[PDB]
Amino acid sequence: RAGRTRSIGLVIPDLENTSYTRIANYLERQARQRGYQLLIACSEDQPDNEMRCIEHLLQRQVDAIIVSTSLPPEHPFYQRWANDPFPIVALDRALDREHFTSVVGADQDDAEMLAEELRKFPAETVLYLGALPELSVSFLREQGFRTAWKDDPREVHFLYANSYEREAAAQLFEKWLETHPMPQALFTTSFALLQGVMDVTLRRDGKLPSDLAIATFGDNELLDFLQCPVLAVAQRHRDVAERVLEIVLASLDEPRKPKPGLTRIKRNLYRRGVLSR
Amino acid sequence: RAGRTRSIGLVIPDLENTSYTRIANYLERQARQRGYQLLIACSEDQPDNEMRCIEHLLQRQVDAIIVSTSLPPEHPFYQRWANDPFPIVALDRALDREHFTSVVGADQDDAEMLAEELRKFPAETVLYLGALPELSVSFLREQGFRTAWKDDPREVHFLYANSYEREAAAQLFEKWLETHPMPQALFTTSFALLQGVMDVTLRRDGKLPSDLAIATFGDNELLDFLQCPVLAVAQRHRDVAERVLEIVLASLDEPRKPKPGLTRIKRNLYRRGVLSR
Ligand SMILES: [Mg+2]
Numbered sequence: 001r002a003g004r005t006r007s008i009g010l011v012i013p014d015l016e017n018t019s020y021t022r023i024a025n026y027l028e029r030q031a032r033q034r035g036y037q038l039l040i041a042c043s044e045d046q047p048d049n050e051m052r053c054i055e056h057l058l059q060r061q062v063d064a065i066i067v068s069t070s071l072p073p074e075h076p077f078y079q080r081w082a083n084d085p086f087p088i089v090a091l092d093r094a095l096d097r098e099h100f101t102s103v104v105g106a107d108q109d110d111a112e113m114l115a116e117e118l119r120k121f122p123a124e125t126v127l128y129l130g131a132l133p134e135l136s137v138s139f140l141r142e143q144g145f146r147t148a149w150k151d152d153p154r155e156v157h158f159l160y161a162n163s164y165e166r167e168a169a170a171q172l173f174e175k176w177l178e179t180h181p182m183p184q185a186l187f188t189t190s191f192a193l194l195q196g197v198m199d200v201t202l203r204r205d206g207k208l209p210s211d212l213a214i215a216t217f218g219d220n221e222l223l224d225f226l227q228c229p230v231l232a233v234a235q236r237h238r239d240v241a242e243r244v245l246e247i248v249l250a251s252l253d254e255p256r257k258p259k260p261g262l263t264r265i266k267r268n269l270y271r272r273g274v275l276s277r
Numbered sequence: 278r279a280g281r282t283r284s285i286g287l288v289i290p291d292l293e294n295t296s297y298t299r300i301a302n303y304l305e306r307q308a309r310q311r312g313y314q315l316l317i318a319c320s321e322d323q324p325d326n327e328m329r330c331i332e333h334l335l336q337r338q339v340d341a342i343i344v345s346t347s348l349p350p351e352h353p354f355y356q357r358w359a360n361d362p363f364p365i366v367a368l369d370r371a372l373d374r375e376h377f378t379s380v381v382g383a384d385q386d387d388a389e390m391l392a393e394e395l396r397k398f399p400a401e402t403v404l405y406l407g408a409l410p411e412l413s414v415s416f417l418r419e420q421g422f423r424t425a426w427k428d429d430p431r432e433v434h435f436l437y438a439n440s441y442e443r444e445a446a447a448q449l450f451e452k453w454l455e456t457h458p459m460p461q462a463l464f465t466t467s468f469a470l471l472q473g474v475m476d477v478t479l480r481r482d483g484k485l486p487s488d489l490a491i492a493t494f495g496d497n498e499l500l501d502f503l504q505c506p507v508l509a510v511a512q513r514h515r516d517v518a519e520r521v522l523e524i525v526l527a528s529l530d531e532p533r534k535p536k537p538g539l540t541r542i543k544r545n546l547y548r549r550g551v552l553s554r
Pocket residue numbers: 267268269
């Protein structure tokens with residue numbers, strides 16, 4: 001009755017993806033310290049499931065909802081709250097810049113940062129293995145890569161898989177090797193795509209060779225088991241969770257609400273492989 | 278007022294550990310399908326934090342609490358609900374067998390299963406790298422290993438780290454190699470302990486050699502990047518989540534409550550390395 005539950009909804013695809021769980025982990029920790037209960041609802045990245053998760057959280061009267069939406073930004077479902085005190089804050093994937101605050105990545109800047117450091121290696125063959133070129137995220141990462149290499153004299157091969165997947169990249173990378181030599185510099189826009197070339201580089205060269213510079217999005221601590229140079233960008237998961245919660249709490253308790261639009265948070269570049277020494 | 282919130286508390290250390298998040302992921306999915314909201318509270322494995330997480334969930338009137346407790350089983354905190362309709366179901370780590378149902382592992386059976394399959398390799402040097410021998414879990418896994426090797430003629434070296442850690446095993450394994458040769462069969466009770474020997478086997482042999490049979494608890498999909506035989510046991514995370522929720526819902530809605538005590542769920546043995554082919 002015009003009160004609050006001191007609870008926050010969080011709609012994400014699942015509690016499996018390495019990146020979403022890390023942010024949820026810090027989000028839960030920082031919210032409980034502030035006296036808020038997180039109400040996690042997993043959509044499995046399906047639109048119909050997400051919209052039901054939103055309505056169930058509303059039924060439980062959460063004070064706000066943090067959502068990583070599977071819909072287009074101005075899909076009309078979220079426009080229901082376009083001019084509404086109820087705070088809906090987008091995470092990772094953006095809502096309408098006009099009416100919602102979204103904490104998102106800086107994929108173009110991240111890729112230029114990651115590509116530039118890969119350009120430091122003077123390798124002759126360079127491969128850019130990506131996926132789903134028609135997606136805005138794929139384009140931004142490609143635009144960032146090309147910006148770092150606009151004046152580099154080397155030809156860069158661009159190879160796009162049809163899904164951000166392990167086995168998909170594996171068979172794409174093998175047919176590509178029937179026609180070209182193995183690259184001396186590799187650039188993957190997803191760490192799953194890098195797994196795919198491994199199952200080829202294992203099934204072909206037996207080992208994984210050195211004298212090969214890898215740059216990738218995502219990150220594993222098992223990237224340190226690589227004797228070749230490996231560069232990698234990963235989200236500042238706890239900075240992102242902090243910023244999201246700042247926006248939620250500011251929308252709830254403070255007179256001048258946060259302004260709508262995108263707030264981007266850069267990734268950190270980590271030096272794996274022989275680089276770590 | 279004698280009703281229900283249709284919500285379940287889940288107190289775990291964090292949403293970071295690979296194993297707890299997987300179970301929470303399936304627990305959330307199966308509970309939302311049944312109309313229950315999960316209220317996750319992370320204790321960071323600290324007793325004072327866990328007891329506060331329990332009281333905050335009680336303040337929010339959850340119908341039941343699933344807890345992976347950091348306390349001893351008959352620590353008197355949970356005895357407050359020893360003869361109480363309110364359901365408290367233990368996960369991973371057990372509560373008092375007399376008053377609570379606990380869904381726990383089968384570490385002794387799992388280790389005998391994992392050790393037996395390692396005994397199939399006829400290697401000469403066998404190393405058992407564990408941690409914290411005074412813990413009941415450590416003892417059970419050692420007892421299971423020794424049961425599979427009671428009549429095997431090979432000497433098994435037993436090497437205990439002082440913490441289930443990556444760098445801790447690394448320096449322990451190096452000093453141990455100043456005195457012994459590198460094993461041809463390896464047995465780790467934690468996948469973090471196996472990382473530790475890697476940072477030695479990388480810093481010493483440069484590569485990671487083959488002709489070496491590894492058996493480990495835990496599991497990674499990046500265990501498939503190993504050209505040596507690697508056996509590994511991991512929890513059936515979704516079976517465990519199913520059983521836990523069955524017990525919670527049976528305690529809440531059905532006349533004859535579930536009986537207290539331990540229900541153990543075996544791990545699955547997965548064949549990684551060259552075995553996967
Ligand atoms: Mg940086």
